[PDB]
Tab-separated table of C-alpha atoms and ligand atoms in Angstrom:
chain	number	residue	atom	x	y	z
I	1	UNK	CA	-13.067	-19.422	16.751
I	2	UNK	CA	-11.189	-17.573	19.497
I	3	UNK	CA	-9.594	-14.280	18.509
I	4	UNK	CA	-6.162	-15.124	19.943
I	5	UNK	CA	-5.728	-18.223	17.800
I	6	UNK	CA	-6.717	-16.070	14.822
I	7	UNK	CA	-4.078	-13.462	15.685
I	8	UNK	CA	-1.361	-16.102	16.067
I	9	UNK	CA	-2.336	-17.673	12.740
I	10	UNK	CA	-2.226	-14.257	11.057
I	11	UNK	CA	1.225	-13.513	12.477
I	12	UNK	CA	2.552	-16.897	11.373
I	13	UNK	CA	1.066	-16.329	7.912
I	14	UNK	CA	2.852	-12.990	7.542
I	15	UNK	CA	6.128	-14.528	8.689
I	16	UNK	CA	5.917	-17.498	6.312
I	17	UNK	CA	4.912	-15.427	3.281
I	18	UNK	CA	7.735	-12.983	4.013
I	19	UNK	CA	10.177	-15.896	4.143
I	20	UNK	CA	8.929	-17.228	0.788
I	21	UNK	CA	9.312	-13.764	-0.736
I	22	UNK	CA	12.826	-13.599	0.714
I	23	UNK	CA	14.187	-16.887	-0.592
I	24	UNK	CA	12.514	-16.431	-3.971
I	25	UNK	CA	13.935	-12.894	-4.150
I	26	UNK	CA	17.520	-13.864	-3.292
I	27	UNK	CA	18.099	-14.753	-6.948
I	28	UNK	CA	16.159	-11.576	-7.867
I	29	UNK	CA	18.078	-9.230	-5.571
I	30	UNK	CA	17.205	-5.554	-6.029
I	31	UNK	CA	18.348	-2.279	-4.486
I	32	UNK	CA	15.900	0.201	-2.980
I	33	UNK	CA	17.723	3.257	-4.378
I	34	UNK	CA	16.427	2.530	-7.892
I	35	UNK	CA	13.013	3.938	-8.816
I	36	UNK	CA	11.265	2.891	-12.030
I	37	UNK	CA	8.444	4.943	-13.511
I	38	UNK	CA	5.314	3.448	-15.019
I	39	UNK	CA	4.484	1.629	-11.764
I	40	UNK	CA	2.810	4.456	-9.836
I	41	UNK	CA	-0.192	2.194	-9.198
I	42	UNK	CA	2.012	-0.269	-7.281
I	43	UNK	CA	1.825	0.885	-3.639
I	44	UNK	CA	4.451	0.837	-0.903
I	45	UNK	CA	5.556	4.467	-0.741
I	46	UNK	CA	3.356	5.391	2.240
I	47	UNK	CA	2.858	3.918	5.717
I	48	UNK	CA	-0.279	1.837	6.207
I	49	UNK	CA	-2.426	2.540	9.272
I	50	UNK	CA	-6.147	1.895	8.659
I	51	UNK	CA	-7.722	-1.480	7.923
I	52	UNK	CA	-9.360	-0.524	4.620
I	53	UNK	CA	-6.054	0.742	3.226
I	54	UNK	CA	-4.460	-2.632	3.971
I	55	UNK	CA	-7.391	-4.454	2.371
I	56	UNK	CA	-7.274	-2.380	-0.819
I	57	UNK	CA	-3.477	-2.528	-1.091
I	58	UNK	CA	-3.456	-6.303	-0.611
I	59	UNK	CA	-6.205	-6.653	-3.225
I	60	UNK	CA	-4.107	-4.625	-5.673
I	61	UNK	CA	-1.065	-6.762	-4.838
I	62	UNK	CA	-3.066	-9.939	-5.455
I	63	UNK	CA	-4.296	-8.568	-8.783
I	64	UNK	CA	-0.820	-7.704	-10.043
I	65	UNK	CA	0.556	-11.009	-8.759
I	66	UNK	CA	-2.011	-13.079	-10.657
I	67	UNK	CA	-1.266	-10.833	-13.634
I	68	UNK	CA	2.090	-12.691	-13.853
I	69	UNK	CA	2.302	-16.170	-15.491
I	70	UNK	CA	4.376	-18.308	-13.123
I	71	UNK	CA	3.587	-21.079	-10.648
I	72	UNK	CA	5.426	-19.728	-7.602
I	73	UNK	CA	3.789	-16.347	-8.235
I	74	UNK	CA	0.454	-18.182	-8.260
I	75	UNK	CA	1.307	-19.590	-4.832
I	76	UNK	CA	2.163	-16.115	-3.514
I	77	UNK	CA	-1.152	-14.831	-4.867
I	78	UNK	CA	-3.048	-17.655	-3.151
I	79	UNK	CA	-1.337	-16.892	0.160
I	80	UNK	CA	-2.174	-13.184	-0.145
I	81	UNK	CA	-5.804	-14.095	-0.817
I	82	UNK	CA	-5.827	-16.192	2.359
I	83	UNK	CA	-4.219	-13.260	4.181
I	84	UNK	CA	-6.948	-10.926	2.914
I	85	UNK	CA	-9.639	-13.301	4.160
I	86	UNK	CA	-7.881	-13.455	7.539
I	87	UNK	CA	-7.719	-9.652	7.691
I	88	UNK	CA	-11.435	-9.416	6.911
I	89	UNK	CA	-12.066	-11.904	9.719
I	90	UNK	CA	-10.083	-9.641	12.051
I	91	UNK	CA	-11.963	-6.561	10.841
I	92	UNK	CA	-15.302	-8.181	11.627
I	93	UNK	CA	-13.810	-9.327	14.937
I	94	UNK	CA	-13.168	-5.704	15.913
I	95	UNK	CA	-16.984	-5.284	16.076
I	96	UNK	CA	-17.000	-2.411	13.567
I	97	UNK	CA	-19.991	-2.632	11.222
I	98	UNK	CA	-18.883	-0.432	8.325
I	99	UNK	CA	-20.347	-2.048	5.180
I	100	UNK	CA	-17.822	-3.990	3.118
I	101	UNK	CA	-16.910	-2.267	-0.165
I	102	UNK	CA	-14.132	-3.651	-2.362
I	103	UNK	CA	-12.833	-3.504	-5.919
I	104	UNK	CA	-12.230	-0.380	-8.028
I	105	UNK	CA	-9.322	-1.335	-10.268
I	106	UNK	CA	-8.913	-0.104	-13.861
I	107	UNK	CA	-5.544	-1.691	-14.753
I	108	UNK	CA	-4.854	-0.991	-18.420
I	109	UNK	CA	-1.356	0.170	-17.505
I	110	UNK	CA	-0.965	-3.196	-15.764
I	111	UNK	CA	-1.528	-5.067	-19.024
I	112	UNK	CA	0.791	-2.647	-20.809
I	113	UNK	CA	3.700	-3.178	-18.440
I	114	UNK	CA	3.029	-6.927	-18.300
I	115	UNK	CA	3.309	-7.173	-22.078
I	116	UNK	CA	6.305	-4.800	-22.040
I	117	UNK	CA	8.128	-5.042	-18.685
I	118	UNK	CA	7.572	-8.531	-17.238
I	119	UNK	CA	10.844	-8.679	-15.293
I	120	UNK	CA	10.697	-5.154	-13.872
I	121	UNK	CA	7.050	-5.551	-12.884
I	122	UNK	CA	7.811	-8.830	-11.119
I	123	UNK	CA	10.805	-7.560	-9.152
I	124	UNK	CA	9.291	-4.206	-8.171
I	125	UNK	CA	5.989	-5.811	-7.168
I	126	UNK	CA	7.762	-8.415	-5.035
I	127	UNK	CA	10.012	-5.843	-3.349
I	128	UNK	CA	7.231	-3.368	-2.590
I	129	UNK	CA	4.926	-6.161	-1.404
I	130	UNK	CA	7.630	-7.431	0.960
I	131	UNK	CA	8.133	-3.914	2.298
I	132	UNK	CA	4.384	-3.531	2.742
I	133	UNK	CA	4.186	-6.826	4.643
I	134	UNK	CA	6.996	-5.691	6.930
I	135	UNK	CA	5.037	-2.487	7.583
I	136	UNK	CA	1.895	-4.477	8.448
I	137	UNK	CA	3.910	-6.713	10.768
I	138	UNK	CA	5.358	-3.598	12.411
I	139	UNK	CA	1.975	-1.932	12.930
I	140	UNK	CA	0.000	-5.063	13.864
I	141	UNK	CA	1.143	-4.930	17.497
T	98	UNK	CA	-20.688	-51.436	7.619
T	99	UNK	CA	-17.713	-49.877	5.832
T	100	UNK	CA	-14.645	-48.129	7.271
T	101	UNK	CA	-11.622	-46.586	5.532
T	102	UNK	CA	-8.799	-45.057	7.543
T	103	UNK	CA	-7.332	-41.939	5.927
T	104	UNK	CA	-3.678	-40.888	6.076
T	105	UNK	CA	-2.163	-37.748	4.562
T	106	UNK	CA	1.435	-36.666	4.026
T	107	UNK	CA	2.992	-33.237	3.473
T	108	UNK	CA	6.447	-32.448	2.134
T	109	UNK	CA	8.670	-29.984	3.957
T	110	UNK	CA	8.552	-27.361	1.196
T	111	UNK	CA	4.799	-26.757	1.720
T	112	UNK	CA	4.157	-27.183	-2.016
T	113	UNK	CA	2.849	-30.770	-2.174
T	114	UNK	CA	0.069	-32.703	-0.431
T	115	UNK	CA	-0.019	-36.504	-0.460
T	116	UNK	CA	-2.806	-38.653	0.969
T	117	UNK	CA	-3.130	-42.432	1.099
T	118	UNK	CA	-5.951	-44.805	2.016
T	119	UNK	CA	-6.353	-48.586	2.160
T	120	UNK	CA	-8.578	-50.541	-0.239
T	121	UNK	CA	-8.938	-53.331	2.323
T	122	UNK	CA	-12.791	-53.631	2.221
T	123	UNK	CA	-13.869	-52.969	-1.383
T	124	UNK	CA	-12.508	-56.044	-3.216
T	125	UNK	CA	-15.718	-57.950	-2.443
T	126	UNK	CA	-17.835	-55.693	-4.712
T	127	UNK	CA	-17.656	-57.004	-8.283
T	128	UNK	CA	-17.797	-54.192	-10.809
T	129	UNK	CA	-17.337	-51.429	-8.232
T	130	UNK	CA	-15.718	-48.351	-9.755
T	131	UNK	CA	-13.637	-46.305	-7.322
T	132	UNK	CA	-13.373	-42.512	-7.113
T	133	UNK	CA	-12.598	-39.720	-4.629
T	134	UNK	CA	-14.441	-36.514	-3.729
T	135	UNK	CA	-12.938	-33.554	-1.880
T	136	UNK	CA	-14.554	-30.311	-0.729
T	137	UNK	CA	-12.652	-27.172	0.249
T	138	UNK	CA	-13.585	-24.672	2.953
T	139	UNK	CA	-12.851	-20.986	3.392
T	140	UNK	CA	-11.077	-21.429	6.740
T	141	UNK	CA	-10.384	-24.262	9.195
T	142	UNK	CA	-11.815	-27.732	9.687
T	143	UNK	CA	-15.241	-27.668	11.359
T	144	UNK	CA	-16.439	-29.283	14.578
T	145	UNK	CA	-18.579	-32.118	13.202
T	146	UNK	CA	-17.582	-33.316	9.711
T	147	UNK	CA	-20.301	-33.916	7.139
T	148	UNK	CA	-20.859	-34.445	3.423
T	149	UNK	CA	-20.880	-31.273	1.346
T	150	UNK	CA	-23.485	-31.459	-1.457
T	151	UNK	CA	-21.103	-29.764	-3.909
T	152	UNK	CA	-17.671	-31.357	-4.301
T	153	UNK	CA	-14.799	-31.763	-6.759
T	154	UNK	CA	-13.473	-35.075	-8.128
T	155	UNK	CA	-9.814	-36.065	-8.261
T	156	UNK	CA	-8.358	-39.232	-9.772
T	157	UNK	CA	-5.937	-41.509	-7.924
T	158	UNK	CA	-3.425	-44.083	-9.140
T	159	UNK	CA	-2.633	-47.606	-7.939
T	160	UNK	CA	0.902	-48.377	-6.769
T	161	UNK	CA	2.641	-51.728	-6.264
T	162	UNK	CA	2.474	-51.901	-2.459
T	163	UNK	CA	-1.336	-52.020	-2.453
T	164	UNK	CA	-2.346	-48.439	-1.604
T	165	UNK	CA	-4.272	-45.911	-3.674
T	166	UNK	CA	-2.215	-42.788	-4.353
T	167	UNK	CA	-3.051	-39.231	-5.413
T	168	UNK	CA	-1.948	-35.680	-4.680
T	169	UNK	CA	-3.125	-32.067	-4.554
T	170	UNK	CA	-1.338	-29.172	-6.263
T	171	UNK	CA	-1.176	-26.291	-5.395
T	172	UNK	CA	-1.956	-26.516	-1.671
T	173	UNK	CA	-3.401	-24.086	0.861
T	174	UNK	CA	-1.690	-23.362	4.169
T	175	UNK	CA	-4.782	-22.503	6.249
T	176	UNK	CA	-7.768	-23.892	4.339
T	177	UNK	CA	-9.811	-26.870	5.484
T	178	UNK	CA	-10.322	-29.879	3.215
T	179	UNK	CA	-13.243	-32.286	3.596
T	180	UNK	CA	-12.684	-35.507	1.650
T	181	UNK	CA	-14.087	-39.028	1.741
T	182	UNK	CA	-14.347	-42.305	-0.171
T	183	UNK	CA	-17.350	-42.938	-2.419
T	184	UNK	CA	-18.400	-46.175	-4.126
T	185	UNK	CA	-20.799	-46.362	-7.079
T	186	UNK	CA	-22.536	-49.520	-8.275
T	187	UNK	CA	-25.783	-50.809	-9.755
T	188	UNK	CA	-27.836	-51.118	-6.545
T	189	UNK	CA	-27.402	-47.609	-5.126
T	190	UNK	CA	-24.592	-45.563	-3.629
T	191	UNK	CA	-22.746	-45.846	-0.316
T	192	UNK	CA	-20.724	-43.057	1.300
T	193	UNK	CA	-17.897	-43.563	3.769
T	194	UNK	CA	-17.568	-41.752	7.105
T	195	UNK	CA	-15.331	-38.805	6.224
T	196	UNK	CA	-12.377	-37.262	8.055
T	197	UNK	CA	-11.188	-33.648	8.152
T	198	UNK	CA	-7.473	-32.846	7.960
T	199	UNK	CA	-5.805	-29.469	8.391
T	200	UNK	CA	-2.909	-28.943	5.947
T	201	UNK	CA	-0.680	-27.387	8.619
T	202	UNK	CA	-1.202	-30.284	11.061
T	203	UNK	CA	0.380	-32.993	8.873
T	204	UNK	CA	3.584	-31.201	7.851
T	205	UNK	CA	6.946	-32.821	8.466
T	206	UNK	CA	10.301	-31.083	7.890
T	207	UNK	CA	13.538	-32.096	6.193
T	208	UNK	CA	16.424	-33.633	8.142
T	209	UNK	CA	18.770	-31.011	9.615
T	210	UNK	CA	21.940	-30.681	7.559
T	211	UNK	CA	25.464	-29.907	8.803
T	212	UNK	CA	25.531	-32.206	11.821
T	213	UNK	CA	28.891	-32.291	13.601
T	214	UNK	CA	30.353	-33.483	16.889
T	215	UNK	CA	33.521	-33.319	18.969
T	216	UNK	CA	34.848	-34.566	22.303
T	217	UNK	CA	35.875	-31.902	24.804
T	218	UNK	CA	38.793	-33.769	26.368
T	219	UNK	CA	38.863	-31.311	29.281
T	220	UNK	CA	35.426	-31.981	30.788
T	221	UNK	CA	33.808	-35.163	29.498
T	222	UNK	CA	30.508	-34.146	27.891
T	223	UNK	CA	29.898	-34.771	24.197
T	224	UNK	CA	29.167	-31.587	22.225
T	225	UNK	CA	26.945	-31.618	19.119
T	226	UNK	CA	25.056	-28.891	17.237
T	227	UNK	CA	22.663	-28.496	14.301
T	228	UNK	CA	20.761	-25.912	12.278
T	229	UNK	CA	16.975	-25.937	12.056
T	230	UNK	CA	15.419	-26.358	8.594
T	231	UNK	CA	14.064	-23.298	6.828
T	232	UNK	CA	10.510	-24.703	7.026
T	233	UNK	CA	8.323	-24.835	9.016
T	234	UNK	CA	8.870	-21.521	10.838
T	235	UNK	CA	7.111	-22.802	13.966
T	236	UNK	CA	9.061	-23.892	17.030
T	237	UNK	CA	10.429	-27.429	16.897
T	238	UNK	CA	11.733	-29.981	19.391
T	239	UNK	CA	14.730	-32.212	18.702
T	240	UNK	CA	15.607	-35.750	19.812
T	241	UNK	CA	19.158	-37.125	19.790
T	242	UNK	CA	20.655	-40.622	19.770
T	243	UNK	CA	24.240	-41.767	20.267
T	244	UNK	CA	26.191	-45.006	20.409
T	245	UNK	CA	29.396	-46.863	19.660
T	246	UNK	CA	30.746	-47.723	16.203
T	247	UNK	CA	30.547	-51.188	14.693
T	248	UNK	CA	28.329	-53.679	12.920
T	249	UNK	CA	25.519	-53.577	15.498
T	250	UNK	CA	24.600	-50.490	17.521
T	251	UNK	CA	23.268	-50.407	21.091
T	252	UNK	CA	21.761	-46.947	20.844
T	253	UNK	CA	20.747	-44.582	23.637
T	254	UNK	CA	17.985	-41.983	23.367
T	255	UNK	CA	17.788	-38.378	24.559
T	256	UNK	CA	15.892	-35.212	23.679
T	257	UNK	CA	16.184	-31.429	23.834
T	258	UNK	CA	13.037	-29.377	24.420
T	259	UNK	CA	14.173	-25.741	24.161
T	260	UNK	CA	13.712	-24.868	20.489
T	261	UNK	CA	16.211	-21.996	20.705
T	262	UNK	CA	18.988	-24.371	21.841
T	263	UNK	CA	21.442	-25.065	19.026
T	264	UNK	CA	23.859	-26.817	21.418
T	265	UNK	CA	23.664	-29.744	23.825
T	266	UNK	CA	25.710	-31.538	26.477
T	267	UNK	CA	25.653	-35.251	27.189
T	268	UNK	CA	27.179	-37.573	29.779
T	269	UNK	CA	29.252	-40.356	28.219
T	270	UNK	CA	31.193	-43.477	29.169
T	271	UNK	CA	34.211	-43.622	26.831
T	272	UNK	CA	36.056	-40.803	25.097
T	273	UNK	CA	39.218	-42.273	23.568
T	274	UNK	CA	37.057	-44.102	21.004
T	275	UNK	CA	34.728	-42.719	18.310
T	276	UNK	CA	30.991	-42.158	18.799
T	277	UNK	CA	28.125	-41.885	16.304
T	278	UNK	CA	25.283	-39.361	16.557
T	279	UNK	CA	22.235	-38.266	14.555
T	280	UNK	CA	19.277	-35.931	15.083
T	281	UNK	CA	15.648	-35.455	14.035
T	282	UNK	CA	13.107	-32.680	14.509
T	283	UNK	CA	9.352	-32.204	14.839
T	284	UNK	CA	6.834	-29.547	15.826
T	285	UNK	CA	6.548	-28.805	19.541
T	286	UNK	CA	2.746	-28.942	19.765
T	287	UNK	CA	2.512	-32.485	18.413
T	288	UNK	CA	1.030	-32.083	14.949
T	289	UNK	CA	2.895	-33.372	11.931
T	290	UNK	CA	5.202	-36.367	11.990
T	291	UNK	CA	8.794	-37.256	12.788
T	292	UNK	CA	11.312	-36.407	10.057
T	293	UNK	CA	13.537	-39.479	9.591
T	294	UNK	CA	16.976	-39.014	11.132
T	295	UNK	CA	20.153	-37.225	10.066
T	296	UNK	CA	23.140	-38.196	7.963
T	297	UNK	CA	25.789	-40.244	9.814
T	298	UNK	CA	28.455	-37.925	11.217
T	299	UNK	CA	31.520	-39.659	12.633
T	300	UNK	CA	33.427	-38.222	15.574
T	301	UNK	CA	37.165	-37.640	15.866
C	3	UNK	CA	14.735	3.699	-27.482
C	4	UNK	CA	17.605	1.200	-27.566
C	5	UNK	CA	19.966	0.059	-30.299
C	6	UNK	CA	20.526	-2.852	-30.502
C	7	UNK	CA	18.014	-4.351	-28.038
C	8	UNK	CA	19.814	-7.695	-27.841
C	9	UNK	CA	23.157	-9.318	-28.642
C	10	UNK	CA	24.682	-12.798	-28.857
C	11	UNK	CA	28.288	-13.602	-27.962
C	12	UNK	CA	30.015	-16.451	-26.147
C	13	UNK	CA	32.407	-16.044	-23.223
C	14	UNK	CA	35.676	-14.472	-24.304
C	15	UNK	CA	34.915	-11.058	-25.796
C	16	UNK	CA	33.639	-7.602	-24.918
C	17	UNK	CA	30.154	-6.069	-25.229
C	18	UNK	CA	28.660	-2.871	-26.645
C	19	UNK	CA	25.422	-0.988	-25.882
C	20	UNK	CA	23.703	2.270	-26.825
C	21	UNK	CA	20.751	3.960	-25.124
C	22	UNK	CA	18.862	7.244	-25.278
C	23	UNK	CA	16.481	8.123	-22.446
C	24	UNK	CA	13.114	9.748	-23.165
C	25	UNK	CA	11.183	11.435	-20.345
C	26	UNK	CA	7.800	13.084	-20.941
C	27	UNK	CA	8.696	15.634	-23.635
C	28	UNK	CA	12.295	16.245	-22.530
C	29	UNK	CA	15.461	14.331	-23.427
C	30	UNK	CA	18.154	14.313	-20.757
C	31	UNK	CA	21.788	14.929	-21.588
C	32	UNK	CA	24.441	12.217	-21.413
C	33	UNK	CA	26.915	13.486	-18.799
C	34	UNK	CA	24.452	12.653	-15.991
C	35	UNK	CA	23.338	9.135	-16.956
C	36	UNK	CA	24.408	6.068	-14.985
C	37	UNK	CA	24.113	2.489	-16.250
C	38	UNK	CA	22.593	-0.410	-14.323
C	39	UNK	CA	22.695	-4.204	-14.438
C	40	UNK	CA	19.931	-6.472	-13.085
C	41	UNK	CA	19.001	-3.641	-10.672
C	42	UNK	CA	21.552	-5.124	-8.272
C	43	UNK	CA	24.981	-3.767	-9.212
C	44	UNK	CA	26.300	-0.300	-10.032
C	45	UNK	CA	29.042	-0.136	-12.663
C	46	UNK	CA	32.058	2.054	-11.797
C	47	UNK	CA	32.577	5.156	-13.913
C	48	UNK	CA	35.639	3.770	-15.728
C	49	UNK	CA	33.406	1.617	-17.941
C	50	UNK	CA	31.533	4.373	-19.823
C	51	UNK	CA	32.166	6.618	-22.805
C	52	UNK	CA	30.305	9.411	-24.588
C	53	UNK	CA	30.019	9.438	-28.377
C	54	UNK	CA	27.928	12.621	-28.549
C	55	UNK	CA	25.641	14.822	-26.474
C	56	UNK	CA	22.713	12.395	-26.571
C	57	UNK	CA	24.001	8.802	-26.184
C	58	UNK	CA	25.541	6.778	-23.343
C	59	UNK	CA	28.124	4.167	-24.386
C	60	UNK	CA	29.338	1.297	-22.193
C	61	UNK	CA	31.980	-1.310	-23.059
C	62	UNK	CA	32.179	-4.372	-20.824
C	63	UNK	CA	35.358	-6.413	-20.417
C	64	UNK	CA	35.952	-10.132	-19.798
C	65	UNK	CA	32.294	-11.071	-19.545
C	66	UNK	CA	31.545	-14.256	-17.610
C	67	UNK	CA	28.852	-16.824	-18.356
C	68	UNK	CA	25.567	-15.640	-16.893
C	69	UNK	CA	23.881	-17.561	-14.088
C	70	UNK	CA	20.287	-18.715	-14.677
C	71	UNK	CA	17.688	-16.781	-12.686
C	72	UNK	CA	14.365	-18.589	-12.481
C	73	UNK	CA	12.665	-19.115	-15.822
C	74	UNK	CA	14.723	-16.243	-17.237
C	75	UNK	CA	17.874	-16.908	-19.260
C	76	UNK	CA	19.065	-13.350	-19.984
C	77	UNK	CA	20.489	-10.489	-17.944
C	78	UNK	CA	18.940	-7.036	-18.267
C	79	UNK	CA	20.758	-3.695	-18.395
C	80	UNK	CA	18.968	-0.388	-17.806
C	81	UNK	CA	19.834	3.229	-18.601
C	82	UNK	CA	18.446	5.483	-15.875
C	83	UNK	CA	18.368	9.165	-14.929
C	84	UNK	CA	19.740	9.862	-11.446
C	85	UNK	CA	17.680	7.159	-9.724
C	86	UNK	CA	14.822	6.969	-12.270
C	87	UNK	CA	14.834	3.909	-14.549
C	88	UNK	CA	12.672	3.536	-17.639
C	89	UNK	CA	10.642	0.364	-18.067
C	90	UNK	CA	12.355	-0.870	-21.237
C	91	UNK	CA	15.718	-2.634	-21.236
C	92	UNK	CA	18.229	-4.365	-23.479
C	93	UNK	CA	18.702	-8.135	-23.623
C	94	UNK	CA	22.061	-9.746	-22.820
C	95	UNK	CA	22.694	-13.314	-23.993
C	96	UNK	CA	25.871	-15.380	-23.786
D	1	NAG	C1	13.570	-40.009	4.600
D	1	NAG	O1	14.295	-39.269	3.615
D	1	NAG	C2	14.122	-39.764	2.281
D	1	NAG	C3	15.036	-38.950	1.397
D	1	NAG	O2	15.661	-37.902	2.125
D	1	NAG	C4	12.655	-39.656	1.884
D	1	NAG	O3	12.481	-40.217	0.588
D	1	NAG	C5	11.779	-40.393	2.889
D	1	NAG	O4	10.407	-40.179	2.585
D	1	NAG	C6	12.070	-39.917	4.311
D	1	NAG	N1	11.310	-40.700	5.272
D	1	NAG	C7	10.030	-40.453	5.569
D	1	NAG	C8	9.405	-41.363	6.582
D	1	NAG	O5	9.405	-39.539	5.042
D	2	NAG	C1	38.097	-6.714	-26.156
D	2	NAG	O1	38.751	-5.798	-25.279
D	2	NAG	C2	40.155	-6.050	-25.130
D	2	NAG	C3	40.659	-5.085	-24.084
D	2	NAG	O2	39.703	-4.910	-23.047
D	2	NAG	C4	40.856	-5.894	-26.474
D	2	NAG	O3	42.241	-6.183	-26.324
D	2	NAG	C5	40.236	-6.835	-27.496
D	2	NAG	O4	40.797	-6.600	-28.782
D	2	NAG	C6	38.722	-6.624	-27.553
D	2	NAG	N1	38.084	-7.491	-28.543
D	2	NAG	C7	37.975	-8.836	-28.549
D	2	NAG	C8	38.582	-9.598	-27.401
D	2	NAG	O5	37.402	-9.418	-29.462
């Protein structure tokens, strides 16, 4: 498939998933000036530049999103998985042959917060994931 | 020979897939159980469709109008589906010629709410405006129809191409009376389907 | 460390909470704490009180029926240090 069609599809995917996060987060409105400890393994506090960082961060986001038991969250997770596959397609498109290595998650704290802090985990994960997606959209061009 | 046309339908929320197909050439097989097989792909529909050796079944229900009905949940925005009709019986097995459908190519939106109109008595063009639905985010083209008010309506048709245009201007014949207008929207490229019409908004 | 973690009361009466914040091996004082609701609204300083050096007390007034938010049917209130909120919270039910 041509690369340009792929890029347009990626951009549309980011825009649609951001919109879903937005209208599902309107009832879960949060303020950025509130930091909650115990979620240091949720990313979003640093800018994202390199491809592998995006891949690993999106994998972590997918993991925490499927760690939550709700249908809409399942849909978000499925869309992020499709986004990750699209990003891998782009990475291979760039004609860089660094061997693919993925994984490396030891999320015991994830289970702890899920059994203790369902609501906070959900809202913080959604907010930081939306911020991350905005950063990727900013740096894609 | 055997042939089954396939039609699919997608709601505007991008959370439901509906597909429908006609049973018009299976009634003549006594004892023929029906069933459906669908195979998913990583990305995109391929060039030449074919039968995937590994598949997944999915039951379908019979409605009153005479069409088999079944759905998929949850759905994938950019994943290809390869599905077909299969018939099993006691003298072998026949497979139908399949058809590939992209989920994003059969999406229709909701009608556009908050349709209004007014007559600019100064100039003479009818002014109407709408708001695009939240989904899909892709650019859309709108078609407009107007007419008089009464039992029977002799409509007139017109369209607006520029997706960014939330306003329109239209040459008219009478202005002291009351007109009727509605709108509908669809994707610019051509994929998907028309989305009904809009609620009747009466002019003043 | 909350007491009580939840409460039940219909529309038409006040509310009462009590929290103590634990951080690592240090317990913060009370004069610095600020309350929070649903991580969306900050409560003006008129609505607090201090019983002793180690507890933050808040008394709400003319509570209104809560609005459902997804599958959830309760509103959460958090006691936080500066801008650092602990994971646990109290449950508000009307
Ligand atoms: C028109 O709208 C109604 C309800 O808004 C819906 O049930 C119907 O399916 C729509 N028409 C088409 C062709 O989808
Ligand atoms: C609630 O607070 C009001 C003043 O804010 C007070 O008058 C009343 O006695 C309190 N208790 C109730 C309403 O049960």
